[PDB]
Design a protein around this ligand. Sequence first.
Ligand SMILES: [Zn+2]
Ligand SMILES: [Zn+2]
Ligand SMILES: [Zn+2]
Lengths: 66, 47, 258, 115, 75, 78
Amino acid sequence: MIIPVRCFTCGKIVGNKWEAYLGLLQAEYTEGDALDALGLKRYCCRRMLLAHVDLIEKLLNYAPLE
Amino acid sequence: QQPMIYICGECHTENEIKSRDPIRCRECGYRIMYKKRTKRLVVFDAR
Amino acid sequence: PYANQPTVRITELTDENVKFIIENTDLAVANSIRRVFIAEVPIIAIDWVQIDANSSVLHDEFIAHRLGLIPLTSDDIVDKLQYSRDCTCEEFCPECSVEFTLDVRCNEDQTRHVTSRDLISNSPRVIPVTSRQDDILIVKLRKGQELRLRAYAKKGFGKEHAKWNPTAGVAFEYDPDNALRHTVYPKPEEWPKSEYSELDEDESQAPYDPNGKPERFYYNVESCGSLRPETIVLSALSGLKKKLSDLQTQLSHEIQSD
Amino acid sequence: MNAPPAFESFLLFEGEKKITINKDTKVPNACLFTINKEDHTLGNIIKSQLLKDPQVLFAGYKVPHPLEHKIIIRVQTTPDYSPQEAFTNAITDLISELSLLEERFRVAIKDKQEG
Amino acid sequence: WPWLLPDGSPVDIFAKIKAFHLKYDEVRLDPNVQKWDVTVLELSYHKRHLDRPVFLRFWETLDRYMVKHKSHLRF
Amino acid sequence: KRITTPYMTKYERARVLGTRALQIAMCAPVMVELEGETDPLLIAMKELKARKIPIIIRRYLPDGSYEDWGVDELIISD
Ligand SMILES: [Zn+2]
Ligand SMILES: [Zn+2]
Ligand SMILES: [Zn+2]
């Protein structure tokens, strides 16, 4: 739903990188260069941003039961 | 000593609904209502 | 019979990782030191969350979990704090915890990013890794959603919960060339050279060394930002030294306890 | 519902001996050391250090059941040197090795930063 | 008995010497003997034929001991 | 002048340990020194092995006859 805080396999913090990754992808970076820019070297960490789907953006479309 | 506050559906506005009252929103008359979060202590391990 | 004479040589030291080489030590000692880096190295992490009010699309436990995983700058306070279970005070106190507060409400039209900058702390030395780069996204809020919670960060270690694991990735490796044949390759030439291979591009693996022990254990300890990466290693050594001092105490007592 | 709390891998209960020694019956000079609330982090170093002792005939360890917080190190040495002291010494000096490592790493670190 | 330790411990006999203990196969071994350095011999209640190999094992072990450690003694 | 097999069937041994254990649980006197075990099954087993169980097996034959065999008379298998 929301980007995981830490990579499940090793523990590297990746929760602070989804917005950055989106900005890099807003530029014409290829997702592989984007991942290198964000410093994700191990494939376990790269799997986090490549495979993440941000569903919280869909869940926010609904009006809240304030 | 609470009159039993509920949250409307399409309105999202707190209405006081006592027992033996029909569930109708004070405004627009929507029939769906949700209870507001408990006041009891909520504590998690964050695990 | 007596203790062997270990050595160390740091090859790279950054604020994120340390690459070092240990000589004259056992295969078991080098792996136990690795294991301590993962499990038995204390750090501060949120372990108690009182959710006053949560109307975000994320659930109370979801929020709690995410808060638990946020790394806190644990460099001097962690070696001074008392384990919460060991602390004598009722509830929490500065001697055994760091209080955190996050009271946030979205009123502006645009969606609010509830990052770790909203996690206010009762101590100036223990805060999310934000000293000096974006922040860990905790929640996304719509107009009219809120999140108000109190939290306490406890001293713990990675053997109890992964939250207290100070490392991102530990690269333990020894004998880059297959000198001891501890691993047997069906086709040794299909395998890329290790980063530490003292081997030319001609030969595939070092010639078999019959009489030879593993030494020169290469490490790459990467921190999650909680502990400085060299302090993780020092914290391992002090903690293992304590484990052996205490175990010898209990053993000696058990010998006299006949 | 039946999940054990994570603390049970290291927190001592009421009555639990940190270590329990029992003599082994099948051979002379052999004991079984049973550590409670410990695992392979402590089992591999003690096993390996025991093997450097030229007076240690046998040294090794097992975790009787992985969900049981108990490990068994077994030591058997020459008749002129009890297993108890074999264990004691291998820790007496293992502590020294880790202190020696601490001292040597601390100087290598201060030597790397601006050096 | 000589070699009995003055504290009443018989170990100077059994730990230096190959002991024997004759019991039925079924009987749960004696706790002192199981702690002591003594060779158990298992006998059947009804199968008399299985007795001969047991005693042969006795003479075998005894001869091993006599020849390795007490061959200088006279037979 | 009995013709049944002089060996104790696995069923006979089982039902003997079952019944004798239950009697011991109801503290009928035990025929052999307890070294200190307390599980009635372990005591019943010890009795059996010492051949002191006070039970005779009434073995019915298909024709209607029967032969009483003391537990101490026939041979145990295990
Ligand atoms: Zn990873
Ligand atoms: Zn309404
Ligand atoms: Zn406290």
